[PDB]
Structure formats: structure tokens, C-alpha cells
Amino acid sequence: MEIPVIEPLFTKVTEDIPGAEGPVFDKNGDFYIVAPEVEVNGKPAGEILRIDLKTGKKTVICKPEVNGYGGIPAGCQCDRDANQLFVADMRLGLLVVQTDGTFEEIAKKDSEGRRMQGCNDCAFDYEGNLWITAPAGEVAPADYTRSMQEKFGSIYCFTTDGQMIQVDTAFQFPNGIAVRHMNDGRPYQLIVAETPTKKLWSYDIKGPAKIENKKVWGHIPGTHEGGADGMDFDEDNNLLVANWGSSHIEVFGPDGGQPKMRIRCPFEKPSNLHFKPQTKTIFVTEHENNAVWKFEWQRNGKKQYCETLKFGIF
Ligand SMILES: [Ca+2]
Ligand SMILES: [Ca+2]
């Protein structure tokens, strides 16, 4: 159109990853994907994988389970001060996963003593606070439920002082999440995808675990089943959003509203995305083929928290 569409070349990265999700780079430049939808005898047995980018070969580093309840690991962020992954899990809540494949479950309950909800994606701000979507109901051992039909999805902030703070509720499948920063580094806006409603929501970030000014920020095209899944900013603060079911990744400008551009994918179900540091390359997971691809965007990604320095000067 208008809406202009681009059709970049998609190159295959790896294959056969059920529910391929949560692409992420660690501080060494290793690449990981999660496979939330792996099952064994009809019960969850989701996986965290390292991918060798040269070969496409997959290694399962972690198949998390707590007291026999398998995980549904769905979204990732790399930490800054240690090379460890924070993983949103639809059964287990928030996990911290080491490169050796060991892991810990961070919260059974929130800061107000409510049972934790299962999580789908997360985003660190540059202050080190982790903003998390929780579209599932209560974590294991509660019977699994998810908010695709009914409005019981929540949002959390897991703070630098270790508090798991519920910051909003009553979403119909909160999904992708991202933090916008001022040029100086200050976090100031939170964006949350609400998948089936075809909305992106915004909040002003007033401080750690302090959001206000909830607004319907962006509109996701289409009336397909699905909607916005994963998202990330480019270095100019354009927001790229996988629109699962639409065959496109949407591109929003800084001010939201309607997409300014769309990216056609050679598949119907883009799920999540991540830039390779220092490059224009976006890795994309998708659920038509349960596979991972890459393509070149117009500019580099916005640096993730793990690319910033605790002891930086500038
Ligand atoms: Ca997701
Ligand atoms: Ca990402």
C-alpha cells in the first residue's frame, strides 16, 4: 500500500520446534529458542534450546519441570550482570536459566501473596526491571487455563529488589511486551499486546513497577484468529510486531496508531522476533511450520538490557 508492504528475503535458520518462541541472544552471542508446545503423553514437556547458527542444529539445554509438572517456556530475555536467561513459562511462571541448563523457579506467589500466574513474554528496561505478561491462570499445580476467551490475564514487574509485583489485570491474553526509553536511557512507556482483541496498549512508566495512563496505543490489522504476539523496537524506536495469523509483521512508528509499514512473511503465523546485536538481522519464529527464519530490516535493533553496561560512562 499505503499501508506500504515490503517483502524482504527470509532465510531458514532451524526447523521442527513446536510453538517456536522466545528468540534471544545471550551476552556471548549464542542464540536460543524456546519450544513451549512440546508434549510427552499429552502433558507439557517444553524445552529451551541453543541453536548453532552455522548449521541449524538444535541442542536442548533445559526441559524444565517442577515437582513433575512440565513447563511451557514461551518468552525470554537475557540478563545484564550475569549471562543467564529469564524465561516466561505458561505453567511455571518466571524461570532463571543458566547456560549449563540448570534453572530456578522465581515465584509461586506475588508480592501480595496471590498465587503466581503463568507467563508468556517479558522485557527488561534499562533500570533492570523485568516487565512480564501473564496470560495463563495460576501456575502449576493448578489446572492449566489461559485467557484467550476470558479477561484474566495479568501484567507483572519483577524488580531489582526481588519483588514480583502485579501491575495490571483483566487482559484477554496479554502477549508481547516492550519498553520504550528516552534517548538518555530512562524508561518511560510500556507497550503490551492483547492478542485476540487486535490491540496494543500503552502505559506511562513512572518508576519501577509504577505504570499509569493505560491507553489503546495501536491497532493490529485483520480479523483472522490471532493478533499481536511478540514485539521489539528498532534503534529508531519503531515497534515491530508479529501479527500471528496475518502473514505479516507490523511496523509502528514512535507514536503508534496504525502500522506505517508491513512486512510480508512467507508463512501465516509469525510469533516472535529478535534482533541480532550490532546488526539489522531479525530472527523470526513462526507456527505454520514451527520454524525459525531471519531477514534483514532497515536498521539495527534497539539495544536490549544485556547489551548495556552496569559500569558504563556514556
Ligand atoms: Ca508470545
Ligand atoms: Ca524479542
Author numbering: 1 to 314
Authors' description from the paper:
The diisopropyl fluorophosphatase (DFPase) from the squid Loligo vulgaris is able to detoxify a broad range of organophosphorous compounds, including tabun, sarin and soman although its favorite substrate remains the diisopropyl fluorophosphate. Another possible catalytic mechanism for DFPase might involve the activation of a water molecule, as in PTEs, PLLs, human paraoxonase-1, and the lactonase from Staphylococcus aureus (drug resistance protein 35), a DFPase structural homologue.
After refinement, the R and Rfree factors of the DFPase X-ray model improved from 11.1 and 12.8% initially, down to 10.3 and 12.1%, respectively. The hydrogen bond network of water molecules is different in the X-N and X-ray structures, despite the similar localization of water oxygen atoms. Moreover, this electron density peak displays an elliptical shape, whereas all the other electron density peaks revealing water hydrogen atoms in the DFPase X-ray structure are spherical. The analysis of the chemical environment of the water molecule in the X-ray structure shows that HOH_524 is involved in the following interactions: (i) Its hydrogen atom, located with a strong electron density peak described earlier, points towards HOH 511 and forms a canonical hydrogen bond (Ow…Ow distance: 2.82 Å, angle Ow-Hw…Ow = 136°).
